[PDB]
Amino acid sequence: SRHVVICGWSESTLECLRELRGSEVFVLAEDENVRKKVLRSGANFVHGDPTRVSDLEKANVRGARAVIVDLESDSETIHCILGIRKIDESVRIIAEAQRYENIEQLRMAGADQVISPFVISGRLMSRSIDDGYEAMFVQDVLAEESTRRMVEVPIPEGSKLEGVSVLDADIHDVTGVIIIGVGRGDELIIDPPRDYSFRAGDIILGIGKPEEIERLKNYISALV
């Protein structure tokens, strides 16, 4: 319900705005040539340097639900995260790493999540030498066009799945949704063991048709 702030303007943040249509987003960047393109994308543009602390206030990082940082280099990206933390220590920061070497320093400055496009892209290229099935899979489930969506579904308190093992729940046989993992806090287990027992607050990461997903949500709700 709260404004997202986006620092810097790039092809990444352009595809980000396209998925945040309807939401309130501020874009703090120094390139005045991107104003009219930002506005056409349903966001607000703020002219300032994202590395300067005073210009971060104008984009109202305090009380943002999240901040996404993608600047020219990792040096300036770090400087921006350092600047953000000098204002809000708890606000969620998402940063894009250019080079793999710099991931550690970004996390250190205070990024809660680091995205590494050139590393993902390189590892999909190397796996696409014979066939493109993995690269197809990734680029499909992250799309809104796909028949199968990858979704995050929380297990609520009083859920009739509380304390049930993965084996007993039989989620795929019941709902038709494939459980590719369950996360909690900042830890995620891919392909959970058969004996893992569900807790409230666990987030189920799945793949399935919109119809399968609704059957899943009704399956993990409380009995009532």
Residues 13-42 that bind its own copies (CB under 8 A): 13-16, 18-20
Among residues 89, 131, 145, 195, which is the contact residue for its own copies, using CB under 8 A? 131
Q: Does 200 bind its own copies (CB under 8 A)?
A: no
In 10 A of CB 18, how many CB atoms? 11
Closest CA to 5 of 26, 31, 22: 26
CB of 140: closest distance to its own copies in angstroms?
A: 6
Site residues for Na ion per CB under 5 A: 62-63, 88, 91
Per the CB < 8 A criterion, the answer to whether 7 and 29 are in contact is: yes
Among residues 176, 200, 219, 221, which is the contact residue for Ca ion, using CB under 5 A? 176
Q: With contacts defined by CB under 8 A, name the span among 27-35, 80-88, 155-163, 188-196 that binds its own copies.
A: 188-196
Q: Does 191 bind Ca ion (CB under 5 A)?
A: yes
Per the CB < 8 A criterion, the answer to whether 117 and 103 are in contact is: no
Q: With contacts defined by CB under 8 A, name the span among 29-37, 83-91, 108-116, 216-224 that binds its own copies.
A: 108-116
Q: What is residue 53's DSSP assignment?
A: H
Closest CA to 150 of 140, 160, 163, 159: 140
Distance, CA of 90 to CA of 62 (rounded, Å): 9
Instruction: Indicate the residue among 150 and 200 with the shorter CB distance to its own copies.
Output: 150
| Count of chain residues binding Ca ion (CB under 5 A) | 6
Q: How many residues does the chain have?
A: 224
Per the CB < 8 A criterion, the answer to whether 34 and 98 are in contact is: no
Among residues 57, 72, 99, 210, which is the contact residue for its own copies, using CB under 8 A? 99
CB of 59: closest distance to Na ion in angstroms?
A: 12
DSSP states of 184-203 = ETTEEEES--TTPBP-BTBE
Residues 21-80 that bind Ca ion (CB under 5 A): 70
Please choose which of Na ion, Ca ion, its own copies, none residue 63 contacts, taking the beta carbon within 5 to 8 angstroms, the exact cut-off set by kind: Na ion
Distance, CA of 52 to CA of 95 (rounded, Å): 17
Q: Does 157 bind its own copies (CB under 8 A)?
A: no
